[PDB]
């Protein structure tokens, strides 16, 4: 709607949405992941364990 009251209303809705969501989390497991072989990841022993 491009009016000042409309922009203030739009900001209100976005802030309320952001406060319900909270802080978005970081990536935690990507850097600690050890890269396996293709046969190692498809190993039956790994699946069975």
């Amino acid at each position: 709607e491009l009016t000042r009251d409309a922009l203030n209303e739009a900001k209100m809705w976005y802030v309320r949405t952001l406060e319900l969501l909270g802080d978005e989390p970081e990536d935690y497991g990507s850097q600690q992941w050890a890269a396996p072989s293709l046969s190692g990841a498809a190993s039956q022993t790994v699946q069975a364990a």
Binding site: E26, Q31, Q32, W33, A34, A35, P36, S37, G40
Partner: protein, 537 residues
Amino acid sequence: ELYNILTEEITEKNADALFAQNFSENITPENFASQSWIAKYYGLELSEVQKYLGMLQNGYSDSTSAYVDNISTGLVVNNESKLEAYKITRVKTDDYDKNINYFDLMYEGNNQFFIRANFKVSREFGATLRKNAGPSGIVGSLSGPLIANTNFKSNYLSNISDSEYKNGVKIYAYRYTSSTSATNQGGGIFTFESYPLTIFALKLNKAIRLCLTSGLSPNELQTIVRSDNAQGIINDSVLTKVFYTLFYSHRYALSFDDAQVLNGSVINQYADDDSVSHFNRLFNTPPLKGKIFEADGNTVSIDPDEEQSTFARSALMRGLGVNSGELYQLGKLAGVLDAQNTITLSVFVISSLYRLTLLARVHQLTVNELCMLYGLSPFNGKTTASLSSGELPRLVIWLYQVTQWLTEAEITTEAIWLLCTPEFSGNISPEISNLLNNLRPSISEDMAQSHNRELQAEILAPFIAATLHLASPDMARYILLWTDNLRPGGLDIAGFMTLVLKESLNANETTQLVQFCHVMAQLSLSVQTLRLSEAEL
């Protein structure tokens, strides 16, 4: 005050006092062991923080790699009760990406060992060298079989001093495929720093503030400081070099890497796990067929007359965008020539050659034009590599003034060279021959042996004006008087006259004669080019 923060020296005595002066009361050096805390305090993302600190050793799985592309952690040294914080950075070396999942250097307090994973499985061992398979190059070994995708520890590497742990190639994967065949399957150059925790935090504070305010990468700044001192401290020289990096980048429309070379730094070789180093983009994208690397230190001839040239010369040529003859000119200009017209393939030598090509490129000069202009400069006789850190910016700004002036005055490089060079043909040109033949009948030994240089110029003026296409005889007189003051070949105006009045008794006084006429022609042509008025002259 920020200047005081950046430049104050840090010692083990004042480290505790400086930390209290630079951080809040509720902040302790142990806080710097959390990468997330550093991100919040300095307003950085975790990915941006890892450009400084890499990966923190916090007990991961056994393979996991340990470089992103740096490794760091706090280690209480177990020979005493001190707690060190260390940081290691790696620069990948030829053929690392075929074979080798990772090649990691690990620190444990005063000694280091290796961790390796492999792409292709082989049944033999691997001897980690440091030199070019030299007699004293062995620094460790890996006991096999070296199967793929498997972790391997290496027995507390030995034959490396602590001084080379700063800028020292810790690596060679001299891995055997058979009982009698081995090849350098790749590796990386490792740089090690260790500090007490409080000092480590203070240095990291300096780097982040300087990078944030200047826009430099953490490794671009690291390269700049590495080109001034080994200890990695920030001082006036580093800050001055940072200014010239920013200033050259704006003025010459150069990347921060290219402007970095212009300020006096070496070519950057750091890679950031998803980018290509400045060195690799220049020389190995695409490779000739293999990878050229400065981690050679070897001797290669850049003699153009050489039969059976080297791969290293060809890869060097293509990276600089020059041919064999121009590369030789750059070697003499830089003064990096050695015995048998050879150079040493290091970053310092290669960056010296690249700096010259950058100097010519940004000023719209060819390599030959750069050599010509440098000869006329007040820097001639001095090789560029043997220039002080204050003289190099002076050379760059001088090159800017002349090239901008030449474009403004519409004078070509060849034209300005002919106007000012001391080089002369040494032959009596037909213009000089006609001058002498027309001058003798109107000249006598009595006039030549007189004492009035003012009167001798008046007699000679009409003949000089005719041979030099000058506007008026009066202009020729002042050109002659100017030449008399300069005394080109030691000849004065009277000495020139006596040489004219010789029945070809010119043994090698012709050299003085033609040198006298060469300078006179330059002075007259300079006046005509500037369109100077007779009143001003």
